[PDB]
Amino acid sequence: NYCNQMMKSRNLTKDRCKPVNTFVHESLADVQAVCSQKNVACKNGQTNCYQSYSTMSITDCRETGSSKYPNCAYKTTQANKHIIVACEGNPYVPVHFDASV
Amino acid sequence: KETAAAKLERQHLDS
């Protein structure tokens, strides 16, 4: 399972199980470039979020019901959606993943 | 140690 591999491989589930996580299969620069695209509000009302003009290749990792540390279990879902990231700093880079649409 | 930009990258980027 790609999700099981990448979550422990990326130090996300090496010390516990995370309920959900999203991976974007695009170049780093292409994702950083979203910080100057469609400005929209974040879920918390904050206004430093931006939506990508185009859909992107992503894989959603969701923990099944039979998942318990130390044996996490994820269901893998591949799709193409617009990503929403919060940006901050200089360079104005993405610091948080807000959502996919 | 790790910046928020670096953490976001390692957690969500699979280019």
UniProtKB/Swiss-Prot annotation, chain B:
The residues annotated as the active site are 12
Task: List the range of the whole protein covered here.
Answer: 27 to 41 of 150
The identity of this protein, by name, is Ribonuclease pancreatic
Species of origin reads Bos taurus
Q: Which residues are glycosylated?
A: 1, 7
Q: Where in the cell is it found?
A: Secreted
Tell me the residue numbers annotated for binding substrate: 7, 10
Q: Which family does it belong to?
A: Belongs to the pancreatic ribonuclease family.
Q: What does this protein do?
A: Endonuclease that catalyzes the cleavage of RNA on the 3' side of pyrimidine nucleotides. Acts on single-stranded and double-stranded RNA.
The entry's note on the tissues where this protein occurs is: Pancreas.
Going by the entry's taxonomy, the superkingdom of the source organism is recorded as Eukaryota
UniProt subunit comment: Interacts with and forms tight 1:1 complexes with RNH1. Dimerization of two such complexes may occur. Interaction with RNH1 inhibits this protein. Monomer.
